[PDB]
Amino acid sequence: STGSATTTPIDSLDDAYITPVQIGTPAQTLNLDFDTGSSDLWVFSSETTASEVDGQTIYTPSKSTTAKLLSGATWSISYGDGSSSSGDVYTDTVSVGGLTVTGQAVESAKKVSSSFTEDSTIDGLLGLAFSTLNTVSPTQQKTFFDNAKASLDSPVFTADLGYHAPGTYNFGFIDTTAYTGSITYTAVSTKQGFWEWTSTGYAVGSGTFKSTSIDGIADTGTTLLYLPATVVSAYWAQVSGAKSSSSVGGYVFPCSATLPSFTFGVGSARIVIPGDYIDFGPISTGSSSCFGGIQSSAGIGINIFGDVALKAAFVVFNGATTPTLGFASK
């Protein structure tokens, strides 16, 4: 089997991407944030504290003839950005772009933190990291990909995120028309439960490539590109007037600037992030100070190849016995 679904930016800055997901019988369609940095499929629901729902589409398990309460099961998660959610668990039928899993753990939110409430465009998350990170207790549950894997034509999914435009998540096949040149594959460590790999270095604009190992994770659920302070300083040094602002919480730059590109290495291959991808607009409405899309990972404890980096590539998440990551230009 295979699946193919379109993923759409939630706003004009590509702050995140939503993908429609069918849950239950009859189908209830929710727009979820496909997140290769976590491993819980959770949804706004009829069980969510009413005051914490503000415009999201909810899952109502009592209206699904295939929903079954997973007795005694609870979940609770906190994300790198400080957000959190928790609740109970159902199993139900879940389909993504024509690909169907029966008995998928659907984690129903009783509580969500304010950032989720305040974002009406995201109805929940669909985790695509390794199932070892799943928070359901006392019986850990598998991710959607893990549940589908054996049925897929090939045990892979691919992320093709758009810049200021829709993209695609495919399951079970590699669309050879979706990229240019070849796919370069690189080793993955699953020891932290992430799609963790090692970039071979970087360049700023037309500058010379610096060969240097950068360990980090391929994370569709993080907006920006988070890299070591040395690297990030090297980048913003090329932008007149850019500075790290403690009060804003990162590097800012004059909105009148033209940003240089940023290149990262995948083995011998190179992925070029155009400068425009690194502009995330005014820090506050009407400001002429703009927020940078490349930021320091110092204090996160891990480097994150988030959407800013991933949207410049066609990315293969290969879930073979020994997982690997593939990157191609597009």
Curated annotation (Swiss-Prot):
Q: Does the keyword Nucleotide-binding apply?
A: no
Q: Which stretch of the full-length chain is present here?
A: 90 to 419 of 419
Known EC number:
3.4.23.22
What organism is this sequence from?
Cryphonectria parasitica (Chestnut blight fungus)
What's this protein's name?
Endothiapepsin
Q: Output the lineage of the source organism.
A: Eukaryota, Fungi, Dikarya, Ascomycota, Pezizomycotina
Q: Where is the active site?
A: D35, S199
Disulfide bonding pattern of the chain = C255-C290
Q: Which GO terms describe its molecular function?
A: aspartic-type endopeptidase activity
Which superkingdom, per the lineage?
Answer: Eukaryota
Domain named Peptidase A1: which ranges?
17-328
